[PDB]
Amino acid sequence: ESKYNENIEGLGTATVIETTQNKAALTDQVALGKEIIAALTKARAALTKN
């Protein structure tokens, strides 16, 4: 849902976009895991910051 966030907390919710691009371009079945690890770090950070 667009343009809205509950209250004006400085809250973000936020969704982390994947490093590089194209699922089908990744399909190594390895490094995809590296992307998920990286993403888990970053999501841990985003979630922590709020």
Place this chain on the structure above:
Amino acid sequence: ESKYNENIEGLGTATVIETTQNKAALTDQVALGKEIIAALTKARAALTKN
């Protein structure tokens, strides 16, 4: 600050610039992590002297 580092002696404060291009250009987890490590060691060095 411009001048105005009290007394004089062996004292100015160091802002450790980060190598590689500007922040928007490096865009990585591993790269940024590496840079923060190297910068941390450099920082330890700069604080150890004086």
